[PDB]
Structure formats: structure tokens, C-alpha cells
A paper describes a structure:
With the exception of α-hemolysin, which is homo-heptameric, leukotoxins are bipartite toxins, formed by the non-covalent association of two distinct proteins, a class S and a class F component of approximately 31 and 34 kDa, respectively, into a likely octameric species. [name]-[name] leukocidin (PVL) is associated with necrotizing skin infections, such as boils, and plays an important role in the poor prognosis of necrotizing pneumonia. Two additional structural domains are also found: the rim domain anchors the protein to the membrane surface, while the stem domain, closely apposed to the core β-sandwich in the soluble form, contributes two β-strands to the pore β-barrel. Since the binding of [name] to the membrane is a saturable process, the necessary presence of a [name] receptor on the cell surface was thus proposed. This was recently confirmed by Spaan et al. who showed that the C5a receptor is required for the binding of [name] to human neutrophils.
The mutants exhibiting significantly decreased binding abilities with respect to wild-type [name] were: R73A, [name], T244A, H245A, and Y250A, with Ki values ranging from 1.8 to 6.2 nM, i.e. a 69- to 238-fold increase compared to the Ki value of wild-type [name]. Four [name] mutants (R73A, [name], T244A, and Y250) displayed significant alterations for all measured parameters, i.e. at least 50-fold decrease in affinity for hPMN membranes, 2-fold decrease in the slope of Ca2+ influx and 2- to 10-fold reduction in pore-forming capacity. Crystals of the [name] mutant were obtained at a lower pH 6.50, but the conditions were otherwise identical. The latter belonged to the P41212 space group with cell parameters a = 104.86 Å and c = 106.87 Å, 1 molecule per asymmetric unit, and diffracted up to 2.33 Å. In the case of the rim domain, wild-type [name] and mutants T244A, Y246A and N248A displayed only small differences, with r.m.s. deviations comprised between 0.20 Å and 0.30 Å, whereas the structure of the rim domain of the [name] and Y250A mutants were markedly different, with r.m.s. deviations of 1.10 Å and 1.28 Å, respectively, when compared to the wild-type [name] structure. As the result of the [name] mutation, the hydrogen bond found in the wild-type [name] structure between Y184OH and S249OG was lost, and the loop was reorganized with a displacement of 6.0 Å for the CA atom at position 184. For both [name] and Y250A mutants, crystallization was achieved in different conditions than those for wild-type [name] and the other mutants, resulting in a different crystal packing.
Numbering used by the authors: 3 to 121, 126 to 244, 248 to 284
Amino acid sequence: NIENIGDGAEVVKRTEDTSSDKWGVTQNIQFDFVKDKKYNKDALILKMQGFINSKTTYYNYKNTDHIKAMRWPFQYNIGLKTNDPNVDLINYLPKNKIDSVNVSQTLGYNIGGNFNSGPNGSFNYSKTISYNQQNYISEVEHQNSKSVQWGIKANSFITSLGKMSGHDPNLFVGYKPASQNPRDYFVPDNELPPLVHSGFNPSFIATVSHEKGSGDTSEFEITYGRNMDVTHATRRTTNSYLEGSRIHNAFVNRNYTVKYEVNWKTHEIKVKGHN
């Protein structure tokens, strides 16, 4: 749990695993403390992994028998925040808007406080992210020196019907209903991306600096969750056909938030709370 990355430099590693069956979330956090004699600041690389269940559900609408609903994650939320004035968020990955099916990036470190969030010469330490986001797009929703938040949202779909936007109210609505079971007014699982039928496996990185001797502890709040949309499929007769309608941002910030405290001196980590 201690890796030597060079003369006067080492990485002290800690991990925290925290799950919520209520939110359907697992936070697998890697806390890599960068101890370097040539770097005048405390530094910590946080690798945010785990799982966010999609919580996709299908149900009959009110007292009807012609209207069926699909409650699905329009977006996944991944957020990190500190309330410490002595901490600075110095880099994070992914930085830019990315629609690639797979997101794989590397953070590099070179002795003397040199971080290369660009991916010449080798690194003293590296950390890699890797996640799949088929039909979704990743982009930073918010950033400042104390926080970063990504949105991984429904983007572009090709179902059995054609090329659709993640905002299109007809998205996931079936052409013909299979039965009166509410699932059956919506496209089968092989027409659904994994982020809709199963969930998201996040892989995000953030690096923070801390002014040495300004305080031994800092709190970090990490949030993992979803913004749920509701798609209604209405059976009509022209023999039966389905017409789609959407309640966009039906349930926002359905998130599991965990508060962590790091000790810069002892490299120890506690969980202070969660919802």
C-alpha cells in the first residue's frame, strides 16, 4: 500500500468501498497520496469507480390500461466537492465532452508537482480511467477549484427504427405492443444500451493539492446518481400502435452522497456520513 515512485517520492494508497442498496450505488474510491520532497504541496489523486444501477422500471399509468410508463436514467451524475479553502482541484479526467463508446484516459505524474492530464518522456506514476457509455455522452456539468461534476447523458440512438436523439419523446417506445405487461410497450433489452438496461460503471479521476501545514484534515463529498425521465407509451387504434411522450427531468439528483475525511499527515481516511 506504499509504492516508491522515485528518490524522495512515494504514493501511499488507501481505498474506500461504500454501497447503498436504497440508491442502488457502489462507490469504490482509490485515494493515492503523492508524497514528494520536490513538491511543496500535499497532493491526492482520487479515482472514482464503482456502479450505479440504472433503476429502469416499467409500470401501468394510473387507473388506465392503454398507457404504460418506463422510468429510465436520462443522465448519470458523478460529483466531487470539498469545502476546504486550503484544497485546490488541479486536474480531472475526462476533461472534455466525449461521445466515444469507451472512455480510456491516463493521468501522469512527474516528480516536482508535474501532472500530465494530456493523455515527452516517462512518468513517475500514472493512473488510468476506463468506462463504457454506449449511446451516452460525457461532459463536465460544473467545475471550480473545489469541485467537479460530470453528466453522462442519453445522446444518440439507433434502435430498430432509426437514428434518434436522447431528447426525442419517441425514444424506447415500441412500434407494436407485445402484451399488457408494462415492459411490452417498450423496446426489448437487445435494443437498449447497457446504461439503460443495467447501469453505469464510472471511472473518473480528480487530483487535489493541499497547502502543507494549513490543517491536517479535509472533507470531500462524492455524489453518484441519476436524473430519471419518464417515457409514456399510449396505445391507440388506427391495428393498435404506440405514441410516445416524455416527462424530461422527472426525478433529478437521485444520488448517493458520501462525505469522506482525509488526514494529510497520517494518510488515513474516514467516512463521516452518507444519505
